[PDB]
Design a protein around this ligand. Structure first.
Ligand SMILES: [Ca+2]
Ligand SMILES: [Ca+2]
Ligand SMILES: [Ca+2]
Ligand SMILES: [Ca+2]
Ligand SMILES: [Ca+2]
Length: 396
């Protein structure tokens, strides 16, 4: 509870740099050739018994009508999803709560007027994955003022043959909250009421892919999303057809954990003003042996900068860190963190390697306290920290 403390804070600072170096959002760009947009993003699915299944999405949107649309400057959407079960529902089902917000641009079409209140939604999907066919129906509502969606889905053909989480992205970005300074970048609402075509290819790493085509348009008062999905090349006992994905990634976010995050926060926020600047982030990254440019520091901040002020405020930090504990890191990401300590790449963090990190981070730590830290993590007693020991110390 003091060697452990030194691991938690140092670990969380390396984790924060790993988040700030990653691309977790939905990246939107103009596609003038199709009078629409393109998007790309990496989605994480936690594997129930440990690890993560990545799903790489490519996306295109094209207007159904000929009316004028808004072609955006580059920006991203930040999406938080919560999946649950209706305790009264006997059918194979998913309850989905989503918040969708536009950001990434530092400090109103006629279609936007259709979204000022609560709008009912209907969703219909026909799928075929490796010849396993299915249908999904969904219903609920969207409130774009807040970016909020509540949807319940039923598998109307009986048993869903893929995990529910793998259909979330497929099963209405017209409900995004765009801030006042980004209204001209909201392609989705500008296409309404006639609507847009949304097409994706979704590559499940080390597995098969989904292809999707959807029509998103008003049908009277209701926003309808009608989809066809085709999956190919899935492995019979991979994560998808094997049902090895976690359903419900719980927001179980303790007070001990927030406090840990604040200790790592304050390692960056060295003037104690409650925000991290580019100068502050760069100081810590240099001390860890990295050498980012000003432009890279600005792009790292912009990835988690919800208010567009160019700094990571305390609450923006707590949000980014919560999400980093909710979804599992890839092997590549955990090795990268490991390498910050394992300087010589021999697979073992030595007392000398850890002393070097700790005293570069400005923590004054004796011979004796360094040994205490190794001892805290050193399961097999060899006096070093190997990869699997590092993983144990890093996990909650
Ligand atoms: Ca500061
Ligand atoms: Ca900010
Ligand atoms: Ca602020
Ligand atoms: Ca080493
Ligand atoms: Ca060891």
């Amino acid at each position: 509870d003091s060697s452990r403390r030194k691991w938690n804070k140092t670990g969380h600072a390396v984790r924060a740099i790993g988040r700030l170096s990653s691309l977790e959002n939905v990246y939107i760009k103009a596609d003038k050739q199709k009078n629409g947009i393109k998007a790309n993003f990496k989605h994480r699915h936690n594997i129930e018994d440990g690890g993560v299944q990545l799903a790489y999405h490519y996306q295109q949107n094209t207007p159904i009508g000929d009316g004028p649309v808004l072609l955006p400057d580059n920006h991203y959407l930040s999406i938080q999803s919560k999946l649950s079960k209706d305790p009264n529902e006997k059918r194979d089902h998913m309850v989905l709560l989503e918040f969708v917000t536009a950001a990434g641009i530092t400090l109103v079409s006629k279609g936007e007027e259709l979204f000022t209140g609560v709008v009912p939604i209907l969703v219909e999907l026909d799928g075929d994955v490796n010849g396993h066919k299915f249908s999904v129906s969904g219903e609920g509502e969207g409130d774009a003022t807040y970016g909020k969606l509540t949807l319940k889905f039923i598998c109307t053909t009986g048993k869903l043959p893929v995990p529910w989480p793998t259909l979330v992205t497929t099963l209405v970005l017209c409900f995004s909250r765009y801030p006042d300074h980004m209204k001209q970048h909201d392609f989705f609402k500008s296409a309404m009421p006639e609507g847009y075509i949304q097409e994706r290819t979704i590559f499940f790493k080390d597995d098969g892919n989904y292809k999707t085509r959807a029509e998103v348009k008003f049908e009277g008062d209701t926003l309808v999303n009608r989809i066809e999905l085709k999956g190919i090349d899935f492995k019979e006992d991979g994560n998808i057809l094997g049902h090895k994905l976690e359903y419900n990634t719980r927001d179980q976010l303790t007070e001990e954990q927030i406090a840990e995050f604040k200790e790592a926060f304050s390692l960056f926020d060295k003037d104690g003003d409650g925000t991290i600047t580019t100068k502050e982030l760069g100081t810590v990254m240099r001390s860890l042996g990295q050498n980012p440019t000003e432009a890279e520091l600005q792009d790292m901040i912009n990835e988690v900068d919800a208010d567009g002020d160019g700094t990571i405020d305390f609450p923006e930090f707590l949000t980014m860190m919560a999400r980093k504990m909710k979804y599992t890191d890839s092997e590549e990401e955990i090795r990268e963190a490991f390498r910050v300590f394992d300087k010589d790449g021999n697979g073992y963090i030595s007392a000398a390697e850890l002393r070097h990190v700790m005293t570069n981070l400005g923590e004054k730590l004796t011979d004796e306290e360094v040994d205490e830290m190794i001892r805290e993590a050193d399961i097999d007693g060899d006096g070093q920290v190997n990869y699997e020991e590092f993983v144990q110390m890093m996990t909650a």
